[PDB]
Each structure stands twice: as structure tokens, then as C-alpha cells.
């Protein structure tokens, strides 16, 4: 029939009734439209902003609703909810960018959700060795356990040097019981700290099933297995394995290193990429080892005695090591080793970009989170000052 | 003469008649302008959005039409078509960004075109081994053929180890007919699966000409060539080639690996880059091999006996392998090897960025496509719930 | 006193006279403002767009003029010029982005300036061997000269292989005059082609001073120097240099390779980066060679006989070659070689990102230029069809 | 009760009194609102821009204030201050981007603060050797000291070559006092230049504590220590250390090289990243050396005599050097070396992206600063020409 004016605050909008009444489910398609009617002015006064109302009216005109890139999603979805609209009908070309903006905002939302849980006898000491700067004695425990881990690692390394603990002489007086005593002490502090952590843990199951607890137990257990086995003499064999397993104490530094935890998280995130790396690596290794073995099988004194023996050459060449203990001597072997070097470079460089990008993005998340916390504290102080 | 008002819904626009009538081909330059004339108000009421109409009026003023970056191209070209305008007259400085936006949208358009073709006796089994999760027995076939490929590869590798199938003794009782039996079995399942795929293929030509079919046939054929040739005795020579060709069975994993297909696609896309890599690599190799041969020709017992013999040194040095079996002994040879290492590093690193970028963009396309499918399903469910 | 309305087409603007008259140099601060005055409406009707006029009025209010990022610079500076404003007074925070947009547009401007010069007896043949697809016989010359370059390179490589041109026997009948004849032929075609290019060159100075002409002459001249020197017997010495210089014929492929020209351009652009690479490389080499020599000087039979002799070890280690012909034997030497490997990796990786970025940006310029040409042709055809 | 109109210049805005009076602290919530009241028009005329006033009114409606991305922050915070608002209440989703824009602008602010301090007997000569292009004799001093550094480095390198300064003969007449004289001269110019710099330095403490002064003193002092020690005979020992320390004179080129200073700054900025690199590197080295030693301990004549002896193999393998003087001979050793190569590649490549990004961003800062200075000079000249 005619056109009605439905002005937003300040800027006026006018449209035909039939277009406005196409969708009766929304606020503007129902009796709420008649509710906003004003006397002697016939203007539907909405106390909102006109920019989003432009898109709302555009959605009313066509069957398509868009999303302006240069706008705040909070205001956008506030105007959507206020006008009885849903975020699931905003086209498809604009829908993906809207989802990207929503996920970027939700990242901050769950960051604040993790922040606000900051906050009783026993668990107090659990709060001690959970943030090293909460107290002074907790920091003392932190530094003491770090020093003990370091001294244990250093002693384990030094135990094998000649004239330090292994004699190079024949009949002269150089072992040390002091190394055993130092190992006993280090294991004592390690197990005491682990037992205190287990006792102070609010949830025994969550603590025990955690990666750090299993790392601690696999670091401390070898000493106990060794003392148990000493009842069955000191025969070699598994003794070498027990000696090897003592290097796992260096993994306890992940409490003292944020970078170690970031690297663990970025290795967890790229599990598919590392799996593809391993699969393509072993596929290329098998192919090139087979080709190299069959090319170098019939030499004078070739070290390519089998495909498993060619695995060594293939892995040395693909990583661009080039020890030189196994080199091809035939034309075909040389050609295929030349191809193998470049192909291994390509295989290795395939997922390194993804690993780098994930590590960089996690690192940037860490700095963005700490910067957000600091700036939020500063803003709270500034707004409290006024 | 005067100015006429041609207001879009809400916001008014006014302009002189002569400017509006410069182009009679469009909607607003013809009798359609008089059609929209309203009585007692002399306002041309267009039920569109004002933002794009601003650019339309700007095009009417000058001979130049721009494109706003902060807008939806669907709305933009809808307003262009509605007002009798063409997308081929939107300047040149804004034209390229418009084309970029159009191609980004068209990417989603053909993605939906590939999605909507999801969807009868024989071809049903073809649908079995085309998406492994469609049925339960199809997944059984998938895992069975994967296991058989793996066991064939493992047997081919193990066949060459001493004391496994090759005797290291002289007169003691170690070959195995069991290896031949396992090869017969693996080829049996491989050819049965390939024959079933060929029979169930809707188009025999498209299936046979495909890369996967030719890979399967070149993997299975060597056994048949070998059995045919056994009628002509078991003389060596091509027997080594037949043994080598058996490693191609590992290429059948590209059905089981999305990463292998992505790598194949990104190698296809970068064909020019790989060609340039090969050309620059061989050019540098020829140059440096010539220089190194002429610098190291007159040593005591130099292994630089010819330029082809210096190809080996050049390719080892350019890839930073450094076996050490061929090292320069003269000052000129050392200088040119030092230059050769860095130059080869540069040559290799020239197209690796492009290969990395293409692989990353294809990978991102894969995740964006699967995310779009999942979010479209979720949006359909949500809109069905209301 | 009061406020005057100075409405742009459609949207109205009102401001006080004193603010509008602050700058009399501009169009709106002078009698042109009174020129636009309309009767019985007191509205200064400007037939422009309101968005840029908002920034113009903002500049009139304060002493600061901004630049909207979401706008076309062509429209922006058109409104600046139309209103008597200059682009040199648009603040400083917005000035840099304005300059970036202007340079991005000017890049297309000079691209079109290079395009529009596409376009007589002699110079016609110069147009033959300047774009290979202009004619059919020019393409024949292109392929013929490419084949001759390739055969010359292949002959130069093969001339040094034993039993091909160098006898490995003692008294049996294997030199070849055919190699000399092939060299004569290749030099004949090379010099004929170069002479034709020089004759057909519109500017002899520009052609001769060009890099391609000097490459061609240094490739062809060694044969003439050799024939001249043959009058002074065939004594060795410079004969090796003449043989070496024959490999420069492979540089003529830069006509046939766009990638070679792109690499040359990106090496020219990064001259400062390559200079810094060389400087830091030689600095690190000197430092580490001195340290390694003084650490390894007093070994049993060390090959570290001098700092120049340690240059070889340092350059081998810094590039991660590791030949193994020179390895440190002392603790200090091992520590400093371990540091040297990582430091050389860092030094090499310092400017590789810049070289990669420059090569990628030049490559992207090439594709963007060809895409722009193709899309401009398509747009011209489409606009001619209507 | 009713709605009041509070129009900004041109575009009108209307709102209810209760919403406008929610916050009395601001300009519009106090008697300043009544101050702007106009007679016979009841319009609050604000001579500002409407775009930011839209966000101001939106903040008045809700309890949330947003920030438009497509706007100048100078105008934004000018409108915030003019209307009695604070930048600390602009939400949180828009707050972070606002802070990013503020820091980007402040970067230019402190760049201009460092620029404007450009600007008396003694200190004049200090201005001589602080910017080499200020005068002509200062440039002469710059080139003279560069030449003397270069000749000192060259002499130090050449002093160790056989037959140059070290005799290879037995009884024939080849040392040189000329090398000592050249060293005396170089130290003379070095100490004269350093003394002049110290005398002309406005602040002796700031100059002495600087890195360049300590570099100069550690470069010049070894000669004086040597002349002092010559009174205690010429016994070896520390003589080698004094000879080694003479290579530090090459560090004086950082005055002559902007890239050296940029590299120093980017190493200072990435101190945490280099610390993490060192920590992860030594952790991996310890782990892999322990495993390799225990795997290769029981070979025939293995060089894996201890974990410290396996440090050499681990660091050679992790950097992909591969000298080949120590190679594993057992299956376990080969497997763990194969893992070690890839793991070392990962460890090395972890912080190289961050180092590259920091160096690139510092380099881009340098070019952006010099470009800004040049364009500011050009703009000043252009505005002076009008
Ligand atoms: Zn859209
Ligand atoms: Zn434009
Ligand atoms: Zn600005
Ligand atoms: Zn917001």
C-alpha cells in the first residue's frame, strides 16, 4: 500500500509493509512492531545503532543476511538477538568469517575462564609447589630440587670418565662409594618430594595419571629395582638398562622450563604431522635402501650386505650427515644416492613448517595471555584510581 | 535545470538530471527512472541499501566506479545487476581486489558443487572401496589389503638378510620356498582386488587411465613377467630389475594416506618450480664439476679423473653431505668447493619456499573444506531445530 | 554568528562560518564557497560523495586531516584536489599508509606504462629474436641456438671422459678431431647469432653494454684467443684457463629461462644482503680459524699447520659439510668446532630469509603482471561484446 | 518522558533523556549538555564527526563501548577526551586492538622523539667520529681506522703461514721484526683513537661502560700485557692466549657495519630464546651421549670411551656434520644415531624462526625509520614550496 518509517536513533529508515512482514517470527515481523508505534509521528523508534540495523533491513529485503567485517561481533550479535534473529542464517560467504571472529573472541572468553579460578591446611603446601613465587620456602624447595637434579645428572655423566670413577691403570689403587652415596641422596630427595606431592595432591588419580608423576616415578624407580636385584648378584645385562634409565632425571626440568612444556604441547598438537613424517620417512628409506642394495650388491668388498644394512646408508644420506663409512661405488648407486639426499631433504622439510608454525603460535599464545593479564591488572588499577 | 531526489530506503540522495542521464543503458538512465517516480513526493524510492548506492551514484558522477573493500561481494554485484551495471567497468585499481574476492567466493562455490554430488547393484560395491567408512565389510577389505601390502613389503626387505633367506655358511643346510609362497599369496590378493575394482568401475577408461590403476598394475605385473621368464631359465640380469620393481607395492598406501595424495597434488602444482630446480641444479653441477676437475686434475692420485667423476663431488658438496671420499687438495679446488657448498645451498633453497607454501595451502584447503562441511551440517541441524 | 548548511549530495552537513573560513587558500575557504550558494535554500550543493567530505570537514575543524583505510585512494585524492587540498597535509599517522597505497597503485601505473609501449625492415628481425612467439622462423632460431648451446655443453663435458676422447691405453690407436670440428661449428653459430643481434640492435651502445651481450662475447672469445695462441705453440698453462672458460656457454640459457633472469634480478636487489653475508662469513671464518689453529697447533701430526690451513676446516664445518679430512683432536678444538658449526649455521641463515622473500616477491610480481595482462584483455573483449 | 535531539554536524541523533543521563561524570551527562542547548531549535549542536559519536552514543546506551577498526586512533581518542570519556572503559574484545594501534602509533612517537634531538669546541670533534658523513676529516679518520683494523687482521693471519713468518727450513736464514713493528703501529693508532674518543666523550662513565669501549680496550690491552710480561722472559703458556686474543680487533668493524649492530640487537632481544636453545641442546646432548655410550661401550676398538667422549659424536650428529671419525657399529647405536640426527635438527630449528623474525623486524624498523625521515624531509620541502 504505502511505506512506513521505522527510524533508528537519528538516522531514518523507511520500507514497505509487505517486506517487513515477510518473517513474523522476528521482533519486527510481529506485534512488537506495533508496540514501538509512536503517536502523531508514526515512527518506530528503536534505541539501537543504525549500522547493524542496515544489515537487518537488508536481511528483511532479500532472503540473505550478510556480516560487516569492520564491526564488533558483540554489537552484531546483540543486535541480532534484540531483533529476534539467529546467527545461523547469516549467509555462507559471510558465515565463515563470522565463525572465525566468534572463535577468536571465545579464545579470550575461555582465557578469562581459566584466569578467574585463582581463588586450607594441607592443600596450602600443594599451592606451594604449584606456583614457585607464591611463597619463599616453596621457592627454596624449587631451587633445591633443581640443584639436586643437576648434580644427579652431572654425577651420572662423570661416573663414566676414566680416572674419575673408572680406572685406566692395572694394579694401582679408582672406584668410588661416594658416587653410590650421592645417588642414594639424590633418590632420597626425589622420592621425598614425589611423596609430598602425592600426599598434598587434591586428587590422587588425576595426579598419578599425569605425565609429570609418571616421569618422576620412572626416574626414581630404577634405583629401587637395582637395590632389589642386588640380592640376585651383580651380573651384567639389565644393569646396562638400569644405568641408561638414570638419564630420565633430566626430564624433571619441565617444571623449571616453560619452553619444555610448550614443546610438549606443540608435539601433542602435531601428532598427525609427526605420524606422516614417520610414515613418509620409513617409506622413502625402504625404497632407497632396496634400490641402493641392489645397485651396490655386486661390488668387491661392499658394505651393502642387505637392505637392513642399506637402511643405515639411506638414513645417513637423507639427513645430509654423510659419515662416509658407506659410500656407493657404482654409477647407479651414485645416481640414486644423489637423488636420495634431495628426497630426504624434501621429506624432512615437509612437516617442519607446520611444527614451526604450531610452536610459534603456542609461544605467541603464551605471551598474549601474560600481556592480557598484565594489561587487565593495569586497567583495573586505572579504573580504580578514578 | 534543478536537482531531483532519488532517495534509497531511509537515507536521501539528490543529484542533477544531466549527470543521472549520462548513461541511458542502465536502469537509472532509462524510463525505469520515471517508473519509480512517486506522486506528491517526487522521490524515486529504491528498496535497496544506501552504501552500495553511494558507489553507484559516484560512478554516475564520474566515469569511474570503485569497489568498497569492507563489503560483501554478493550484495555488491546484486546491486550492480539490479541497477543495470556490469562488473567489467569497476575501474582497475579496485578491479583486482574485486577479482580476488570473486575467486575466493567461487572457491567455496565449486566446493559446494563438489559436495552436493553425494547422491544400484554392482556400483554399490564400488561405493564400498571408495570411502572406507561407508560400510563394515568395506573397512575389512581396506584393512586386509593394507596388512597384505605391509607384509609383502616386510617380506621383500627380510628376504635379503643373511641367515633369514640368504645362507652365510658354505655346506650346511638357508633358502625358503615359503617366501615364494608368501609372494604368490600377496600377488593373488593384489590382483583379485585390482580385478574387482576394474569390474566395479563405472568407467573402465577413466579407471584404467588413472594413476592408482597404473600404480597397481606396475606393482602386480613383475610377478607375472617373472613367472613367464622362468620358462627361459633363471639367468641373472633382468632378475635384479624384477626384484627392484617389487618395492613399488609400497606406493599403494596412497589410498590409506591422505598426506601422500596431498604431496602428489602439491608436486603436480609445482611442476614448473621442480623443473627450474632441476635445471639450475644441473647447470650449477656442470659448472662446478668442470672447475673442480680442471683445478684437481694434476694431483698425485686424485679421484677427479673426469668431469663426470667430478659430478659426484659436486652433488655431494652442494647438498652438504660431505662423505669425504673425494676432497680437493689444491688451493683453487678448496676455494671452489667452499663456493660450491654455499651455491648449492642457495640453489636447493630457491624453490623449497614455494613447495612449502603450496603444500601448506593445500593442507589448509583440506582442513577448511572438512570444517566447512562439519559446520554446514551443524548449521542445518540447528536451523532444523527451530 | 550562526551555522550554515553545506550539504553534499543527499546527506546534509552544517558548520559555523568561522571554522569554514580558517583556511582561505582552499576552495571552500574562498569565494568558491559563495559561488555554490543556492537561492531560497541557502545550501551549498556539492555533487561529490559524503564519505570523503566527512574527512575534509574534519580537517576544517581541527588542524589535522586523516585518511580512511577502507576507501579508494583515487577517489580520496580526487576529492582532495577538487576541494583545493594537498596530499602533504594529511597528518603523519595516516600519511605512511597513504604513501603505501599510493606506491601500490603507482606500481600498476608503471606496469601499464611498460605494457602500452608494444607498438620497419631491419628492426623487424630484431623483433624476431626478442619475443620467441612473435613468428615461426624466430622460434626456429630460438630452438636451434638452444640445441647448439646444449650440444656444446655436452661435448665439453664428454671431452674429458676416458675412452671417449682421452686414451687410457699406452700404445693402441683415442683423440678426436671431431670434437674440434664440433667446437668450430658451435662457435660459428654462436658468433653468427651474436653478429646478427648486434646488427639488428636499434642501439649499438645499449646492446653492447648489456649483460647478455658481454656474456655472449665472453663465451665466444676463448675460441678465438685459442686459435690466435696456437701460433705460439700448444704449451700448457693458460690452456687450462681457456678450457675452463668454455663452460660459460651454459649462461646463454637465461634467454630461454625466465627463472634465471628472476634469480639475477633478486641477486641484484639483495646486493647489500649478500655483501653483509660475505662480510660476516669471512669475519667468523677468520675468528674460528685463528682459534682452531691455536688450539690444534701442538698435536702429533695435525693438519692445522696455519690459519690459512684452518680456513678450510672452518668453511667445511660452518656449512655443515663435515668431510672429516681435518678433525680437531683436543678438547678445546672440539668445543670450538662444536660452537663453529652452530655459528656458521646462524651466519648462513641470517640473509637467506631476505633472499627468499625477495625471490618470492619478484616471482609474485611476474605472475601478477601476466594475470593482469590476461584479465585486462578479457575485460576489453567483454566490454567490446557489449 | 520524550526524546531529545543532540545532532552532530549534519547528521542528526535523537535519544531518550534517561539513557543520556546514566553517567553524569562525562560531558554529555552533566550541565555541559544544557550548555549546548540552542534556542528555538532544541538541538545540541556538537561540531565533531558523527562516526565516533555513533560509538559514543552506543556506549551511552549499553554499558559497553567498542572501537571501530577502520578509524584513526588520534580522532578516536580526541573524541573520547572531548566528550569526557576514558580509553580504559572500551570493552575488552576491542581493547586489545586499540592497544595494538596505540603502541604502533607510539612507536612513531618515540621515533620522532629520537629524531628531534639532532641539535661547542671539544664535543665538536666528538660529533666528528659519531656520524661519519658530518665532516670530511672525520671520514678520513673513519677510513684510516678501518684500513688499520684490516691490515692488523691480515698481518695476524699471515704471521702463521710457513715461509711468510715461520721457517720451514732447518739451518737457512725466516722470522720478521717487521711484524712486531706493524703490530706496534696498529696498537698505536688504536690506542690514540680510543684515547681521543675517551677525551671527547661528554660522559666518561657512559662511554667507558659502553660495549664498544670495552671491545676496544680488550682489543688493545693484550699488546700492553705482552710487553709487561716480556720482562718475565718469553716462556710459552699464556703467550698462546695473548696471540689468540688479538683476533678481537675484527670486532671493531661494528662501527663500520650497521648489520653487525642489528645482529647484536637481535641477539640481545632473543636472549630467552638463545637460553632455551642452549638448555634444550645440552639436555638432548646429555641424553643421546649417554645412550650412545652405553650402546657402543662394548665394541672392539670403539672410540666411545666415556659419555664426555660421546658428547663429540652427539654434537657432530645433531648438527648434521658427520665427520665420520666416530660412527656407531652396533644396531642400537645406529638406531639411536639416526634418531639423534633428526632430534638435533628439530632442536636447532626450534628458535631459528624466532631469531629470523626478530632480525627481519629490526631490519624493517631500520628501513622504515630511514624512509620516514626521508619522506618527512620531502614533505617539509613540499609544504615550504607552497
Ligand atoms: Zn555475504
Ligand atoms: Zn579505485
Ligand atoms: Zn591519523
Ligand atoms: Zn567489542
Residue numbers in the entry:
A (entry chain C), B (entry chain B), C (entry chain H), D (entry chain F): 40 to 158, 166 to 219, 224 to 436
From the paper:
Modulation of voltage-gated potassium (Kv) channels by auxiliary subunits is central to the physiological function of channels in the brain and heart. Native Kv4 tetrameric channels form macromolecular ternary complexes with two auxiliary β-subunits—intracellular Kv channel-interacting proteins (KChIPs) and transmembrane dipeptidyl peptidase-related proteins (DPPs)—to evoke rapidly activating and inactivating A-type currents, which prevent the backpropagation of action potentials. Here we report cryo-electron microscopy structures of the Kv4.2–DPP6S–KChIP1 dodecamer complex, the Kv4.2–KChIP1 and Kv4.2–DPP6S octamer complexes, and Kv4.2 alone. Thus, our data suggest that two distinct modes of modulation contribute in an additive manner to evoke A-type currents from the native Kv4 macromolecular complex.
We first determined the cryo-EM structures of human Kv4.2 alone and the Kv4.2–KChIP1 complex. The fourfold symmetrical structures of both Kv4.2 alone and the Kv4.2–KChIP1 complex were determined to an overall resolution of 2.9 Å by single-particle cryo-EM analysis with C4 symmetry imposed. The structure of Kv4.2 alone is compact with dimensions of around 75 Å × 75 Å × 100 Å and both N- and C-terminal regions (amino acids 1–39 and 437–630) are disordered. By contrast, the intracellular S6 helix bends at A419 in the structure of Kv4.2 alone, which results in a partial loss of interaction between the intracellular S6 helix and the T1–S1 linker, suggesting a key mechanism of Kv4 gating modulation by KChIPs. Moreover, while S6 gating helices adopt a more flexible conformation with weaker interaction with T1–S1 linkers in the structure of Kv4.2 alone, KChIP1 stabilizes these structures and enhances their interactions in the structure of Kv4.2–KChIP1.
